[PDB]
DNA sequence: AACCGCCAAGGGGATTACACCTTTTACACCAGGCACGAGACAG
RNA sequence: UUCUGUCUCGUGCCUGGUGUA
């Protein structure tokens, strides 16, 4: 349902775990739809800016993530339908990446881009 | 400097290396703009090295007056090669005489009938190509592929690659290759012949074979018929009116520079081959219309002023052209 | 043909909406005499000869 | 530990996957279109004619189209039907071939993070290379290391050179010094002789910098031309000598100089170096003496020393480098 | 044009009458030389014709 | 107005100009085959029948069957 | 216009709503029953139909319908109009069956159309050649029905049930083609002035103004669309771009190019000329000048020759002696060009006299 | 209206066209009468080759260009310092000056812009 | 193999490794022979190409021409089986160039497409769209199935998604005409040698 | 295993359709055109 | 045994219309 699609295309940021793109106030108010039990970024901005980045390239509007090639290549097939970034730059801080490993979630770098 | 009279002239296709060497605009022309404000750009279409622009001014390259310096040539290094309209029919003939994939002539130069052509056409290349081309009509395989030519230390066959030849067809300004017999079940029967693919094919033609095709490599080597370095004419050939209002050639060159920039940029930032193909489709149109704007079928290039541009061919069209109207 | 405009459905309610449509019908035509307005908008009948001298276009508003 | 690329080859598209079809959108409205196409999909997904499309890709590097993935082309269409910015790409969508699909989600290196290198575009800082040190958590303004180009109100009714904090304190103005820390002329934050004032995000461009070694010292396009004698200095063909034929960006075609090798060879410009022999006549085309000419009198691996023909001086140069009056103007010389 | 352009005369003479451009392209592609012996070639240049 | 079409988009795989029409004027039958997905349809023709009529019979059979 | 006196030269053109059987010898047609059809005073462009007979068991008659990519046998067009039996079709062509000479000439066309009988099949046959390939059977048939109703022979009427009148008019065009082919009636002459009409300043300006006004409504459409898609209210006073008519009219009257400036190279030139104020007789004659749209440099003498039909209408002596000789004409002293009037008063009077309406008669 | 004073026209080195540098056209433009092709043919029939040469070169558009003896392409010619060079040959000598009409210079330059080398092989 | 070994010796001597680059034309001109590609692959060409693509003792890449032509050849040598790639190591030798920083972007694209082309069979994928059978598409299409005017208005093509595939809807005169055509031909005033009237198609 | 015949292909030839170029010399005047919407930053 | 003359060949273009031999 549409609560997951960007309200306005101003101030858009991509989650950095699942690359879902929403407006800054959408994350702040409702949180990230795919990744909440391992990151807990609902109710504050400090965690939001630590994990979630505004520097992303392209958007892929995923309508049927279950049945799509673009969803497979991108490792979003098991996520909720929504707008995703093609590539988000950055890395998590050296706290949650350790917590995630401790919790059995293998943090893999969403920086898909090739360098020069 | 001694006075001289033209005892002879010789026509030839300008080699891309010849152009880059004679051109004064080092590095090519990059900027669509003429003046960055007050002064002319050194790498734009109003480059002062490319002859003088203002009366009672001086050419940087030769210090000659407006009435004394010839216009010095410049060049645009095209991102992707493009066909040359006016040489396209000729490229189609050469491309149908040489075997695709390996560029050997489809009829060996040792063949008796070719020897006859060469024996009877000494100094008549135009007629030579016509006759050898008439031999390479009924030839849909590059014969002799069954034999190793170099013995590697262990009468002569054609020594071809054995590949079935495509029949090439023209669709306005684009060339297509069509295979009726395929070499491999995986090979596609119909491909768009990019000018880059025809450049690869012409580069491999040996100098002996292209003499057979009636093209002396000293003056008209076949790969030079593909535009890969575009000669920008000087300001003397495309002067600007002042009341500056630019000439039709400057406007076409502005478009060519714009797309050339966009295209090389799409290459550098790794755009998909289909983006490039749709972009080369535009660069090709503009280079073609800069020489021939009376081309059939394609939309005539028009300035938003509501009038068609007057290309280099139009400047030589006929009556009121350079030859008839000025010489 | 009278104008029929139908707004592009934006789907913001998340449902298939019935976008508003606009109708305009041009009716009676009126044409006044040829008139010249000074740059300040003051109305005057424009004489052909004035038009001929001032390079105006002798026309009437529709 | 299986490598990342090998585990990646597994995901590639095949004939059995939903094809990725190009559409045509209004430039800069590709993102607004793709998102509105999400709202369209959502609105129809429960009705009797749900949209048969899987994903809509709107890359940032492209400018002109979004791509709709659907099993059968006509599915792309029913989605884009009535959609305005995509009205232009309604009549035809080109299937990006299965081998030119992975390179749609291709990204080549946004880039707004500390310890990075950025360039300025507008204002007085034209084409200036800078470095980002820290970013404010509010993301309102960003701190940069730069060199000023202002005159300080004396030339008005300049090149790049390092700032100094003593020749500026005498012209006047509200100057406040507290040791190595200085403040002046509208909070010009300074410390240990260096400026640390913040920049406006619209004026600074992050991508397309690619810094050189010279920048590393503050805080390689070759001079090759056809006719140059060169020697290969790197790679498989080291010590091969040849003459340049053509120069195309950083690609150089050379004719090898051996009775045994007649064919043209192409090398990237990083792999060649000019070379000379005593007695060659050469012109300096760069550096400290650009425009001077002379005969090479001695050659060393480090440099060539040449005798300037007219000014008659010895002049050391690197192998890599080889309006006051007008013609006829009257000059006094002695009184 | 179909008769005289096919004559083995110089490219400039041909170019002076119909099909002016294509004949010059044809000569360029075939590397053809013009002997500068006819009235038209010497007239295109600023030479005293024979 | 213009020239009549002779190559068509396969109504199943939608590949453009992939379908061609063979007209067996002797057995009074037209055969259409997708050179991509190899789908085929055959319909009775007459001397007036043109490729556009065969393609139409294919479309009419598809439009009738997909109900 | 801008202080320049401009005169609209009267442009002659072929008389609409009339049948002309020509013989384009250099073609595959022995005869061509041309008819260029134009609804009423009501404006839209004229659409033209051609009922030709092939040159060459032989002498098949084919109609070239508007928007239909191929020639259609006229018998198929009659079946498409709903006249399925051959007797009924021929009743609209061969008014007197006692004429074996004329009937023997229609047999080749009845033969060619033997494989199609039901109306929907003829409509389908016409549709598949008009509509784009992927159109469904219903839309394709319905489209052929609309082309025959609204596009073929508009002057006959475009209402819901004009198909019987259209069958009679199309039958008359075939009957006349047969007459010409049999030689019972002489071919039509393109230079006979009874077959010509002059577009004076009125129909000339109406031709522009129709285009501009349609453009003006294009702009109100795109402007209001920009406002109403956003849910706001579009103010029409801003939507009307006044300039389109004003500068449109003015432009073509100023340059003489009779068409939209965006496509100037495609439209007629010199329709509006600077009035010749050198001598009063030149001013008077320039205001009385007729122009033939025939392209200059044309070798044909017939369009330039003083046709007998010009007697008393066009001056037999005043024509430029240059390249425009005979194409540019001048009105005779008492030559009047009809301004036009609606036919309804006449039709009413005819209906009250003993005229059988075409739809009622056996 | 055809009065002679509105028709009488004479010229002797008036203004020149900016493109082809030939006498302008028109009486108000102080133009020169066109020496058309039919006139060229009339002088050819006369055998007056020097008058023909004068009319079509000396009295219309006299021009000089420097050509490379090795390639016939027009070379760079700095007359102020008498240094002449043919970029491409890099000979900087073995260059020669040819008298050819400005329109002919114009033409060979338009031919290079189509990638045609009208090599002026004077030697 | 002799050429590549001699280039290793020359590279150790810090001389230009010309032997491979000198033989390259002769090799490329033969690897293109369609009638021999099976013989070439089965004779161990992949091993030799791996040797030529492999970096030299100083870990420099081979001559640019060698990479350009051998990568292009490999694209034109598709019959290579999985066991051939695994045994020859040509896969490693191209993945190496694809990763290598001194490789040019065009060669990286060729190596990238080669790696995709060669890995697809490992995963059973294929990129030839004409390679999927008719029944496979028909089945997949069922698998993907869900739950006024004054002038004639041009109708637009049906956008309907066709799922279901429809069942099919299923001389004495020319002998005399040929005889008359032959009589016409026989009556012609032909000549033994066709004289070129205007010089066109003049022989020799 | 040999020779007579029909079958298939080669190739050279023949006949039909679409593409391209050309269309007289000069000479005077006139008038009109010559792109424009619109969005981002600085005293 | 206060000065001071110091100025020398500028330029639209395309398209269309009418007219002259
Ligand atoms: Zn997330
Ligand atoms: Zn100069
Ligand atoms: Zn071959
Ligand atoms: Zn030279």
TrEMBL record, chain C:
Subcellular location: Nucleus
Coiled-coil segments on the chain, per record: none
Source organism superkingdom: Eukaryota
Record-given protein name: DNA-directed RNA polymerase subunit beta
Protein's organism: Sus scrofa
Described purpose of this protein according to its UniProt entry: RNA-dependent RNA polymerase that catalyzes the extension of a non-coding RNA (ncRNA) at the 3'-end using the four ribonucleoside triphosphates as substrates. An internal ncRNA sequence near the 3'-end serves as a template in a single-round Pol II-mediated RNA polymerization reaction. May decrease the stability of ncRNAs that repress Pol II-mediated gene transcription.
Family to which the UniProt record says this protein belongs: Belongs to the RNA polymerase beta chain family.
UniProtKB/TrEMBL annotation, chain E:
Taxonomic superkingdom: Eukaryota
Compartments, as annotated in UniProt: Chromosome; Cytoplasm; Nucleus
Record's function text: DNA-dependent RNA polymerase catalyzes the transcription of DNA into RNA using the four ribonucleoside triphosphates as substrates. RNA-dependent RNA polymerase that catalyzes the extension of a non-coding RNA (ncRNA) at the 3'-end using the four ribonucleoside triphosphates as substrates. An internal ncRNA sequence near the 3'-end serves as a template in a single-round Pol II-mediated RNA polymerization reaction. May decrease the stability of ncRNAs that repress Pol II-mediated gene transcription.
Record-stated family: Belongs to the RNA polymerase beta' chain family.
Protein name: DNA-directed RNA polymerase subunit
Source organism: Sus scrofa
UniProtKB/TrEMBL annotation, chain G:
RNA polymerase beta subunit protrusion domain sequence ranges: 1-246
Localization in the cell: Nucleus
Signal peptide: none
Domain RNA polymerase Rpb2, residue spans: 15-199, 273-337
Superkingdom assignment: Eukaryota
Family classification: Belongs to the RNA polymerase beta chain family.
Stated role: RNA-dependent RNA polymerase that catalyzes the extension of a non-coding RNA (ncRNA) at the 3'-end using the four ribonucleoside triphosphates as substrates. An internal ncRNA sequence near the 3'-end serves as a template in a single-round Pol II-mediated RNA polymerization reaction. May decrease the stability of ncRNAs that repress Pol II-mediated gene transcription.
Protein's name according to its UniProt entry: DNA-directed RNA polymerase subunit beta
Native species: Sus scrofa
Full-length numbering of the shown residues: 313 to 683 of 1300
């Amino acid at each position: 349902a549409l609560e997951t699609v960007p309200k306005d295309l101003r101030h858009l940021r991509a989650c950095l775990l699942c690359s879902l793109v929403k407006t800054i106030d959408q994350f702040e108010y409702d949180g990230c739809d795919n990744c909440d039990a391992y990151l807990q970024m609902k109710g504050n901005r400090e965690m939001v800016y630590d994990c979630t980045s505004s520097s992303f390239d392209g958007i892929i509007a995923m309508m049927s993530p279950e049945d799509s090639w673009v969803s497979k290549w991108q490792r979003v097939s098991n996520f909720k339908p929504g707008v995703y970034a093609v590539s988000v730059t950055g890395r998590l801080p050296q706290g949650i990446v350790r917590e995630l490993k401790s919790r059995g979630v293998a943090y893999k770098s969403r920086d898909t881009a090739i360098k020069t | 400097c001694p006075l001289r009279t033209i005892k002879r002239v010789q026509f030839g296709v300008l080699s891309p290396d010849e152009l880059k060497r004679m051109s004064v605009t080092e590095g090519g022309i990059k900027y669509p703009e003429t003046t960055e404000g007050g002064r002319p750009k050194l790498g734009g279409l109003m480059d002062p090295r490319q002859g003088v622009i203002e009366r009672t001014g001086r050419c940087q390259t030769c210090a000659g007056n407006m009435t004394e310096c010839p216009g010095h040539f410049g060049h645009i290094e095209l991102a992707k090669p493009v066909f040359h309209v006016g040489f396209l029919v000729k490229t189609m003939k050469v491309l149908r005489c040489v075997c695709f994939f390996c560029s050997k002539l489809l009829v060996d130069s040792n063949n008796p009938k070719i020897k006859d052509i060469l024996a009877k056409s000494k100094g008549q290349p135009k007629k030579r190509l016509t006759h050898v081309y008439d031999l390479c009509k009924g030839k849909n395989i590059c014969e002799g592929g069954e034999e190793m030519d170099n013995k590697f230390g262990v009468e002569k066959g054609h020594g071809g690659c054995g590949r079935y030849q495509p029949r090439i067809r023209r669709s306005g300004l684009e060339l297509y290759a069509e295979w009726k017999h395929v070499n491999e079940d995986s090979q596609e029967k119909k491909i768009l012949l990019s000018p880059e693919r025809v450049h690869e094919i012409f580069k491999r033609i040996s100098d002996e074979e292209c003499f057979v095709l009636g093209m002396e490599p000293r003056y008209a080597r076949p790969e030079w018929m593909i535009v890969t370095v575009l000669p920008v004419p000087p300001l003397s050939v495309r002067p600007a009116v002042v009341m500056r209002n630019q000439d039709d050639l400057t406007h076409k060159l502005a478009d060519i520079v714009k797309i050339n920039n966009q295209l090389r940029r799409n290459e550098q930032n790794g755009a998909a081959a289909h983006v490039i193909a749709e972009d080369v489709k535009l660069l090709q149109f503009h280079v073609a219309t800069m020489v021939d704007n009376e081309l059939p079928g394609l939309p005539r290039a028009m300035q938003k002023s509501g009038r068609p541009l007057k290309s280099l061919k139009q400047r030589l069209k006929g009556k009121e052209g350079r030859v008839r109207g000025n010489l | 043909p009278p104008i029929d405009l139908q707004a592009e459905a934006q789907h913001a309610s998340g449902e298939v909406e019935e976008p508003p449509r606009y109708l305009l019908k041009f009716e009676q035509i009126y044409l006044s005499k040829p008139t010249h307005w000074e740059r300040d908008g003051a109305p005057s009948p424009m004489m052909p000869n004035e038009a001929r001298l001032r390079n105006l276009t002798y026309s009437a508003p529709l | 530990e299986l490598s990342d690329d090998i585990t990646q080859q597994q995901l590639l598209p095949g004939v059995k996957d939903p094809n990725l079809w190009t559409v045509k959108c209004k430039i800069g409205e590709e993102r607004a279109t793709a998102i509105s196409l999400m709202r369209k999909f959502i609105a129809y997904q429960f009705t009797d004619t749900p949209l048969q499309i899987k994903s809509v890709v709107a890359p940032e590097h492209v400018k002109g189209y979004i791509y709709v993935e659907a099993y059968k082309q006509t599915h792309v269409k029913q989605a884009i039907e009535g959609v305005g910015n995509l009205r232009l790409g309604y009549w035809n969508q080109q299937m990006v071939p299965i081998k030119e699909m992975t390179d749609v989600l291709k990204v080549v290196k946004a880039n707004l993070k500390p310890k990075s290198w950025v360039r300025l575009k507008r204002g007085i800082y034209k084409d200036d290379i800078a470095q980002v040190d820290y970013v404010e958590p509010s993301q309102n303004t960003i701190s940069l290391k730069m060199i000023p180009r202002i005159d300080y109100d004396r030339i008005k009714a300049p090149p790049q050179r390092l700032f100094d904090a003593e020749k500026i304190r005498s012209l006047g103005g509200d100057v406040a010094s507290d040791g190595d820390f200085l403040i002046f002329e509208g909070n010009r934050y300074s410390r240990k002789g260096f400026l640390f004032k913040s920049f406006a995000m619209s004026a600074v461009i992050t991508e397309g910098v690619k810094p050189t070694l010279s920048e590393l010292e503050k805080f390689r396009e070759h001079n090759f031309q056809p006719g140059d004698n060169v020697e290969v200095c790197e790679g498989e063909l080291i010590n091969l000598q040849g003459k340049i034929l053509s120069v195309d960006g950083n690609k150089i075609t050379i004719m090898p100089k051996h009775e045994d090798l007649k064919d043209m060879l192409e090398f990237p410009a990083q792999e060649l170096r000019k070379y000379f022999k005593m007695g060659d006549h050469v012109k300096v085309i760069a550096g400290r003496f650009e425009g001077d000419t002379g005969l090479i009198v001695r050659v060393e691996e480090n440099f060539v020393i040449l005798f300037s023909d007219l000014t008659m001086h010895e002049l050391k140069v690197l192998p890599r480098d080889l309006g006051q009056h007008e013609w006829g103007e009257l000059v006094q010389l002695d009184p | 044009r179909h008769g005289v352009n096919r004559q083995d005369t110089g490219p400039l003479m041909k170019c002076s009458f119909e099909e002016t451009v294509d004949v010059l392209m044809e000569a360029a592609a075939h590397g053809e030389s013009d002997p500068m012996k006819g009235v038209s070639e010497n007239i295109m240049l600023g030479q005293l014709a024979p | 107005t213009g020239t009549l079409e002779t190559q068509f988009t396969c109504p199943f795989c939608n590949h453009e100009k992939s379908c061609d029409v063979k007209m067996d004027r002797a057995r009074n039958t037209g055969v259409i085959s997708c050179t991509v997905c190899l789908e085929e349809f055959q319909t009775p023709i007459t001397y007036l029948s043109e490729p556009v009529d065969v393609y139409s019979d294919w479309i009419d059979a598809c439009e009738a069957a997909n109900q | 216009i801008n202080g320049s006196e401009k005169v609209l030269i009267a442009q002659e053109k072929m008389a609409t709503n009339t049948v002309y059987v020509f013989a384009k010898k250099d073609s595959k047609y022995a005869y061509t029953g041309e008819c260029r059809s134009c609804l009423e005073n009501s404006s839209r462009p004229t659409s033209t139909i051609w009922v030709s007979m092939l040159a060459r068991i032989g002498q098949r008659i084919v109609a070239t319908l508007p928007y239909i990519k191929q020639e259609v046998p006229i018998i198929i067009v009659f079946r498409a109009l709903g006249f399925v039996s051959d007797r009924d079709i021929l009743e609209h062509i061969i008014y007197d069956f006692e004429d074996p000479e004329m009937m023997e000439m229609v047999k080749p066309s009845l033969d060619e159309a033997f494989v199609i009988q039901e109306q929907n099949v003829a409509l389908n046959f016409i549709g598949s050649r008009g509509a784009k390939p992927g159109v469904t059977k219903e839309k394709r048939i319905k489209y052929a029905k609309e082309v025959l109703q609204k596009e073929m022979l508009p002057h006959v009427g475009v209402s819901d049930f004009c198909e019987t009148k259209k069958a009679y008019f199309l039958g008359y065009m075939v009957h006349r083609l047969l007459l010409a082919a049999l030689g019972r009636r002489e071919l039509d002459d393109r230079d006979h002035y009874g077959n010509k009409r002059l577009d004076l300043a009125g129909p000339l300006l109406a031709f522009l103004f129709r285009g501009m006004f349609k453009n003006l409504l294009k702009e109100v459409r795109i402007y209001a669309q920009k406002f109403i898609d956003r849910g706001k209210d579009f103010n029409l006073e801003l939507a009307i771009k006044t300039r389109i008519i004003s500068d449109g009219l003015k432009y073509s009257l100023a340059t003489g190019n009779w068409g939209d400036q965006k496509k100037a190279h495609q439209a007629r030139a010199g329709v509006s000329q600077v009035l010749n104020r050198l001598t009063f007789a030149s001013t008077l004659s320039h205001l009385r000048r007729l122009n033939s749209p025939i392209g200059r440099d044309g070798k044909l003498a017939k369009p330039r020759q003083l046709h007998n039909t010009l007697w008393g209408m066009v001056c037999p002596a005043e024509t430029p002696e240059g390249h425009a000789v005979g194409l540019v004409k001048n009105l005779a002293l008492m030559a009047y060009i009809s301004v036009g009037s609606q036919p309804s008063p006449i039709l009413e009077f005819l209906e009250e006299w003993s005229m059988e309406n075409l739809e009622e008669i056996s | 209206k055809h009065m002679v004073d509105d028709k009488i026209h004479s010229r002797a080195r008036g203004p020149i066209q900016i493109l082809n540098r030939q006498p302008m056209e028109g009486r108000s433009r102080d133009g020169g009468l066109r020496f058309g092709e039919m006139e060229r043919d009339c002088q050819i029939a006369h055998g007056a080759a020097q008058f023909l040469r004068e009319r079509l070169f000396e009295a219309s558009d006299p021009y000089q260009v420097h050509v490379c003896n090795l390639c016939g392409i027009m070379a760079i010619a700095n007359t102020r310092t008498h240094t002449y060079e043919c970029r491409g040959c890099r000979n900087k000598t073995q260059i020669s000056l040819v008298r050819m009409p400005y329109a002919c210079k114009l033409l060979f330059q338009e031919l290079m812009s189509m990638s045609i080398a009208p090599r002026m092989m004077s030697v | 193999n002799e050429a590549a070994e001699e280039d290793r010796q020359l590279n150790n001597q810090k001389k230009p490794a010309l032997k491979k680059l000198t033989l390259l034309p002769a090799v490329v001109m033969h690897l293109k022979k369609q009638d021999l590609k099976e013989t070439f692959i089965d004779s161990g060409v992949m091993s030799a190409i791996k040797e030529w693509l492999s970096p030299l003792p100083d870990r420099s890449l081979p001559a640019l021409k060698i990479r350009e032509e051998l990568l292009k050849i490999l694209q034109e040598l598709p019959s290579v089986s999985q066991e051939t790639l695994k045994h020859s190591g040509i896969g490693r030798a191209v993945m190496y160039l694809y990763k290598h920083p001194k490789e040019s972007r065009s060669n990286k694209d060729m190596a990238g497409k080669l790696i995709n082309e060669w890995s697809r069979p490992i995963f059973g994928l294929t990129s030839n769209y004409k390679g999927m059978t008719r029944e496979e598409r028909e089945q997949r299409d069922l698998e993907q199935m869900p739950q006024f005017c004054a002038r004639a208005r041009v109708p637009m093509p049906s956008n309907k998604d066709y799922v279901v595939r429809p069942k099919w809807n299923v001389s004495r005169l020319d002998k005399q005409m040929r005889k008359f055509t032959d009589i016409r031909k026989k009556s012609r005033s032909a000549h033994a040698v066709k004289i070129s009237i205007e010089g066109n198609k003049m022989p020799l």
